[PDB]
Scaffold this active site. Sequence first.
Site, short mmCIF file in Angstrom:
data_model
loop_
_atom_site.label_atom_id
_atom_site.label_comp_id
_atom_site.label_asym_id
_atom_site.label_seq_id
_atom_site.Cartn_x
_atom_site.Cartn_y
_atom_site.Cartn_z
CG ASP A 17 104.78 53.32 -44.67
OD1 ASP A 17 104.23 54.18 -44.21
OD2 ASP A 17 104.25 52.47 -45.40
CG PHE A 68 100.43 61.87 -37.14
CD1 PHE A 68 100.70 63.32 -36.89
CD2 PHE A 68 101.49 61.42 -38.34
CE1 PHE A 68 101.65 64.03 -37.62
CE2 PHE A 68 102.14 62.10 -38.84
CZ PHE A 68 102.52 63.54 -38.58
CE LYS A 69 97.25 53.13 -38.15
NZ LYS A 69 98.24 53.65 -39.19
CD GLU A 75 93.04 68.70 -21.38
OE1 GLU A 75 92.82 68.11 -20.64
OE2 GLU A 75 92.85 70.01 -21.67
CB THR A 76 96.83 65.31 -25.97
OG1 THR A 76 96.90 65.85 -24.40
CG2 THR A 76 97.89 65.09 -26.61
#
Lengths: 211, 211
Positions: A17, A68-69, A75-76
């Site tokens: 992190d 990336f949750k 589509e995105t």
Amino acid sequence: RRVDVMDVMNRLILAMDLMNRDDALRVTGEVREYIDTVKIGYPLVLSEGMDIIAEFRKRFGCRIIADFKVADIPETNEKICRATFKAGADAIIVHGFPGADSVRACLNVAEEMGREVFLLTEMSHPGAEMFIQGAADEIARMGVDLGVKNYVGPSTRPERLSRLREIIGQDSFLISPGETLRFADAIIVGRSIYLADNPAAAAAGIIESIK
Amino acid sequence: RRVDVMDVMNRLILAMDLMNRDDALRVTGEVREYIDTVKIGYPLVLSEGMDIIAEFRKRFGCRIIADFKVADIPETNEKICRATFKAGADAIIVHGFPGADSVRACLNVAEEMGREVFLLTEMSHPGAEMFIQGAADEIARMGVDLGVKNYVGPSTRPERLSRLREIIGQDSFLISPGETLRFADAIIVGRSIYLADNPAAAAAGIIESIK
């Protein structure tokens, strides 16, 4: 362990992190002999670029899980996954709260590119009690009904891991941010390692505990 | 229009969802005379780098809203917001489903850096019916109880915008992905513009409809 799911060395995943490339590479390289799987998130990627993923792989040959949750429309989500896998990620963590189609969009790209999707079923921060906790079981069940084989669950509560296992089965791969390894296949550790004076010894230490 | 909230030229925000820098810059520059606010998401940023935000600002002087649908724990949300604002974003879109503390972490950084946070209260894709739709009103209310002044709501359903307004009030800023502008302060348009042979005319066209 199960043959059809990823093998994480020493059942220990490093949550890298840190947001500085210099520090991130230094710590990861120092623990490569103990850890072969590193979780990278947006703090590092947005600060140093997605090319940092290829560097971790080219320099250390470690597996990379992109935390990336993902939580957008289908589509995105597809575009985010394709860009992330193109960058070299072996797997990506996606939210289940947005629904089945949003998760399936991710699974489709992973299928196409030979990568993996981890479904995040629950979170442990205080605010998670408002909406996430109550949807956790249904999200886990949705994952099962989507053919999901990789999950990220809570950790501060053992009884929640048992509950998750009752839903996903004993074969699916589960990672959690001692007793934890009775339900999860691998544990995720951050601070205790990347902040230690000697992360190499830090990693070896927690591993000895697993032994 | 309210003086204390952002002024979006022509009440039209461009959703620049293209993933190629060349195409993204070409379309945006061509509509700068009609649009001064551009929404950029992860597809473009992960493909071309966060530096693309500074380029949009330096080349076009447009306002940038980062549609990152932030949905992590408080500390990570803080880092994502700080990195995004450092990169130049004027505002960032954040999910409300992770709870109040996760949203507050974002508001804190925006307060510190003089930027803005948009709370996403609901989504319109099919999967949104599973968990998001049922939490929409409470998420909107949570926003009100967090002092949030900027919101992103649905659009395909007019009655939902009226419902959102009943909760957030008539003063807060609301954007939605004719009758829509009766509730939302600005509309977000993507395909109809960045895919047109002449996006300049496309933008001018929809604006004439707003007039």
